[model samples]
Target: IFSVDKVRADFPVLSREVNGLPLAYLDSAASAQKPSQVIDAEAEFYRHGYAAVHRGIHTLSAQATEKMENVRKRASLFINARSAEELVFVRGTTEGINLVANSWGNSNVRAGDNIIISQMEAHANIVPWQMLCARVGAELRVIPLNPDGTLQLETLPTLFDEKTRLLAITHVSNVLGTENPLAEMITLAHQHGAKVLVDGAQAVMHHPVDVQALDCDFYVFSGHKLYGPTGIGILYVKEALLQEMPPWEGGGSMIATVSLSEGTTWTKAPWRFEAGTPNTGGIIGLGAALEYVSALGLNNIAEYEQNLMHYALSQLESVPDLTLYGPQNRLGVIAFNLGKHHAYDVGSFLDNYGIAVRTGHHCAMPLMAYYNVPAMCRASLAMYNTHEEVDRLVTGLQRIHRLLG
Candidate 1:
């Protein structure tokens, strides 16, 4: 068995006490706690090698540039992407989707084109496609969720047709924690000649993804949710799609040459998408975070988390007024609502006990309205989460249930 004590030591923030009790941290689906290695890597970079990358040919600059390049390679290897050229560094998952919508989807999708997505997607995935469709006269479509919060896979085939150009979906719902059947989704999309874009923000933290294996045209996720810095994220595009797409942003680093009079010819797709100075520190931290996660084994981490999720969910079954959302096979997270209580109120009461959790739509308001829930109290998890912490959460819920309900 992996040692819990040793792992807790890897996250210093976990050592801090809250209220009169030890902190029961469960809000990782929003953002994860950083390991000491991830923290130290950023410190080391700033301490010994802080420089503007790709701006000069100097030694420190070269080192920074190489580190940035390595971030691309490491991120590719982590997800089994075809090449580093397939990866582009962006602000986060939101920006990654935006890049795809504007660059790839904009040029290729003609008027009346249809983009299919799930009702369970984060607005990050939903709105960009909506905007893209609006601009190109394409139609934004959704795959309705079943009663159990699992997808209506039986109905997936009927949604695809010639006008369906792209299927933008999330690998895991941030709200439901439901792991969607991505391989099947990809297969369905391809049969109609439609490309697929996966929002891996929540999924990447809980599971290892082989983008090539899933056969997705594009994949996106945030660095912060993976225990790295907030401002950095990743986009992986297939080489075939990359060659076909045009640049979205134009600025310093993404050009082969520029003539002042004549129109500018852009560089390659991945680089062309990144048109400004990149976040250097966050990229370094992301690489180190990948190393840290891989050392412990993502599969091992996930199994541990899934067990905790099962245990947490099982415990919540006894809560007096709890109405949970999401599927039973969820990993690392739970989003639910209580009878006659606002989500913000429950979140506030938990703050008194120093049991951290999230409240609101979780960027999944449509899911909230679909469930007919006002808002939800979401208790998500991370690798360092323990049964004791979960027990503390149950204790808090009991207190809240008694007082509020």
Candidate 2:
């Protein structure tokens, strides 16, 4: 039922040519190409159902509000959250994590408490916790990475202690393509009475996520990386935690009553966090994207992508002196560098052949430092990627190695 050809057809951008050759978009780890279903859904909503949600009692407003709430419900089901109320819409993963840091962190975290984060986390996951620790006079402890780019789980017990308040980690490494063993990590963190936050920016698109199953206190992901529009993302808080956390941002929609004499009272969990007029169109498009992926089947996508990952790894191995980062047991993302060649130069050469790849620190400067590399060329995959495209990428890399090596 899940055909790559059919999937390719759904994404219109895949048909276009770049530099006289067909585009081989290998940067889904950065931002995925949107499908026609997602594009059209947003356009159609703006064209037919344009109205300020939850503001007016007009018929159009009611309809728009209904559509928005429906998407929220859809998103809750997508991640297997307990209820729609647990899901909060933010600008993206960065804002979501910041919200948790400021809201829950400011209240729960104290001067002596420490926050544990892994070395492979993106800057979004790292910086927020760093800022929180700095503000609260808490220490930031990092779980070190092994030579293979996987977390050194052996070191976790030594890092976690009675003073540890939170453990923030990535579900998948954005640059290294390593998937962390979150279940074991979460269980360990919980034994220390520390809440866990899973930065799922890269994991949500590649694998099915169930927050309840993971038992993570917080989970955040961006819509753009999941085949949806930009400027929209999700933040899932466990219901009990959501209820306890205060509003991070204060504004129009998230209010119970604003008084001139008395202090203003705040509203409920999800709405309390979504302080202003949200991206209704983006939310609707995200719903369409979730629907698209669900109908195609995530399990099938995972199985297919795993095979593709193996094929890619094998092909890349043929390139002499090419160094690949991350574990062999990674997801679709593969980061590598050619002998004595800059990642920017390698990425540029690939672009000549119409093969798109991401180059640079990939927002994880600490990880780059850990690898002792200035940068790495990353080719990340999606459901629409083909084995033929993988061959093209390998061929392009081989050409680069020959010409530049």
Candidate 3:
């Protein structure tokens, strides 16, 4: 077991007050608050070894390169990738998926091919595939969801066949908080000779992930959502597949050789995918964030968040006509709408009491259309979130409901 109090202390923002009230930050799904260690790691990198990595002959450049590459090792271990060379650093999961879509999907998917995705996907997962389909003369398919916002896996078989090239899916829903059945889905996709790409933006911080075990062709996530700096994330591709895929972008350091009269030759998989000057400090900070979470143990975080979810659910029942979305077995997020009340109004009411909650379509407009609602209030939790925070949220929502309803 880990100490939630101690974990909370590591986050400096949690100690500060918002509008004279103690901060009750429950928006980890959007972007997690950074711990001191992650912040310090970035600061130390800038202070001591700031340099253009792999492009200079100076000692500072060499040291920074070593440190940044060490982050690759850390991320590889964090996701259980076969090797660091299999991990490609990108802007975030959005960019990572685009890389695969353009590099691999375009090459493999022919006209009339099908790309499978679910209705619960964030726009990051949806739009890229949609663009790919429009460009390649292919059709974009969706796995419909149940009334409770869960995917109807029974319908998966009908949507998949020989024309299916890839199934880009999310490991966890940011808005619905549903932890998807990845193992089953991957097996099914494989049986149909389709590749799987998992968007782990909302799942990696909440669970233990093993890419080898999941047998996914690609796994992508953002560092900011995992308590690290923004502008850096990872794309872990299967080594053999990566070797076959072409480079997504072109610039310095990704090429083996370049000539004006002749053509250019690219480096091997990971480095070839990382085309330009990478986010060195952000990668370093992400490594520290991974180490920080490992120290606490992800299992501990998952267990504690589940308990908090249980308390939050029971407490939320006190609000009259408050309808909850998503299934009961969700990870640590709760999306609900107060009866006929605007999500923004209720969210502002909670803010007055120093509670930070997300409100809107949450980048899942299709899901909102499916549920027949314009928007919702999403309160997401992390390991640092406490029982008292849930109580405050419930109390604030109850009062807000009374005032708004």
Tens-digit lDDT string for candidate 2 (271-344): 99887888998999999999998988899999889888999998888888889889988987999998889999
Give one digit per residue, the lDDT tens place, for model 3 in 115-157: 9999999999999999999999999999999998789989987
Score each candidate by Cα lDDT.
0.87, 0.92, 0.92
Looking at model 1, report the run of 10 residues with the lowest lDDT sum: 16-25
Error of 3 at 383 (Å): 0.7
Position 198, candidate 3: lDDT: 98
Cand. 3 TM to true fold: 0.98
Q: For model 3, which pairs clash?
A: none
lDDT of 1 at 189: 90
> What are the models' TM-scores?
0.97, 0.98, 0.98
How many residue pairs in model 2 have overlapping backbones? Answer: 0
Q: Global CA lDDT of candidate 2, please?
A: 0.92
